């Protein structure tokens, strides 16, 4: 296949939502963050995994792999669920269960 045995990694730049709308238009909502378009692409099977940025020496969850170009195009940014926007629900949920 094209479906790897060994875990893969890539570093990529975060995009602003304003630049991300230059690629995806109104499909970009408040709870999404884009990254990539830099020669790499998340593709089928990466969904739900992490997008992490260093924050004070510690890797922090910034996005969850959500959706992207139907061809896994390396010139189009991938779309990730924006954790900062969903973290109050994460904490509320953990606290209640």
């Amino acid at each position: 296949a094209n479906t790897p045995d060994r875990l893969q990694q890539a570093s990529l730049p975060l995009l602003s939502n304003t630049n991300c709308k230059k690629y995806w238009g109104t499909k970009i909502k408040d709870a999404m963050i884009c990254a990539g378009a830099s020669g790499v692409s998340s593709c089928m099977g990466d969904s739900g995994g992490p997008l992490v940025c260093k924050k004070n020496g510690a890797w922090t969850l910034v996005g969850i792999v959500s959706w992207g170009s139907s061809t896994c195009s390396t010139s189009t940014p991938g779309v990730y669920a924006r954790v900062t926007a969903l973290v109050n629900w994460v904490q509320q949920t953990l606290a209640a269960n």
Binding site: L7, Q9, G45, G49, T60
Partner: protein
């Protein structure tokens, strides 16, 4: 990941593989604690699925992984199957993960936090490396 590179085994300890009842990977996830995994709502995870922690080379006959069962799935209620907005689900594990050298949690940001455009970040996964 298209145009990625193989990570060092165990270097991304929060990375889990969500596998179906017959052992096929279908999505990734991240441990945020020993008892909870965060993934995308669209992955449509069930209690029938399993979380594999500590894995590197899926093609193995074994390495020291852990297969964790899911006790309950918490899908965001604002998740919209049409726009793919609010795409997060939480998995409460039946049994806690045993943290080690190769299995540990990722930190959660604060809602107030800012990650500036231009910042280099990392993504991991067992997705196709070619379309």
């Amino acid at each position: 990941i298209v145009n990625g590179e193989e990570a060092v085994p165990g270097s991304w300890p929060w990375q889990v593989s969500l596998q179906d009842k017959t052992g096929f990977h279908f999505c990734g996830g991240s441990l945020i604690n020993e008892n909870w995994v965060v993934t995308a709502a669209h992955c449509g995870v069930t209690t029938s699925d399993v979380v594999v922690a500590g894995e590197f080379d899926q093609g193995s006959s074994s390495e020291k992984i852990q297969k964790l069962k899911i006790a309950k799935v918490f899908k965001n209620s604002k998740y919209n199957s049409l726009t793919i907005n609010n795409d997060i689900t939480l998995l409460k594990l039946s049994t806690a993960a045993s943290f080690s050298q190769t299995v540990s949690a990722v930190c959660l940001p604060s809602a107030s936090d800012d990650f500036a455009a231009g910042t280099t970040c990392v993504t991991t996964g067992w997705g196709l490396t070619r379309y």
